[PDB]
Structure 1
Amino acid sequence: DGPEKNYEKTMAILQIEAEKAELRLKELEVRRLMRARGDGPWYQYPTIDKALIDHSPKTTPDN
């Protein structure tokens, strides 16, 4: 084929691979920050559910 076909295919491939590399670095930074802070949807280790607490009159008045 023409020399321009390989040129444009190479440009598309380079764009895709550069986007992949940037996304990989972004993902690594995001994962590190989420693990360090725990303020995102990832690394949300479970805690005690507050629906188990019994909010009813107990025996002793001081609860």
Structure 2
Amino acid sequence: RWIARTFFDAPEKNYERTMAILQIESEKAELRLKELEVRRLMRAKGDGPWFQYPTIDKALIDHSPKATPDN
């Protein structure tokens, strides 16, 4: 009785620790699987804001009247 009193944790303490750690890891696992699905559909469809390799920007484009109208 003294050993369980002064040297040990309660079964309810261990129990709620187990429930807390399992809720944490369930959220972690579903976020990881959701991550890889988002990533594969994003690289597939291309509409996502991640895999945008840079195209032209029109900071080097200026429309103005030329020296030949058949431009």
* TM more than 0.5: yes
Aligned-residue Cα RMSD (Å) equals 0.9
Alignment partner of 1:47 is 2:33: no
> How many pairs are equivalent?
63
List alignment gaps of at least 5 residues for structure 1: none
Deviation at 1:59, TM superposition (A): 1.5
Give every structure 1 segment of 4 or more consecutive aligned residues whose post-TM-superposition deviation is greater than 4 Å: none
Deviation at 1:18, TM superposition (A): 0.7
Identity of aligned residues (%): 90
**Aligned equivalent of 1:19, options 27, 45, 48:** 27
TM-score by length of 2: 0.81
The separation in 2 between residues aligned to 1:16 and 1:42, in whole angstroms, is 27
Of structures 1 and 2, the larger Rg is shown by 2
RCO (CA 8 Å, sep 6+): is it higher in 1 or 2?
1
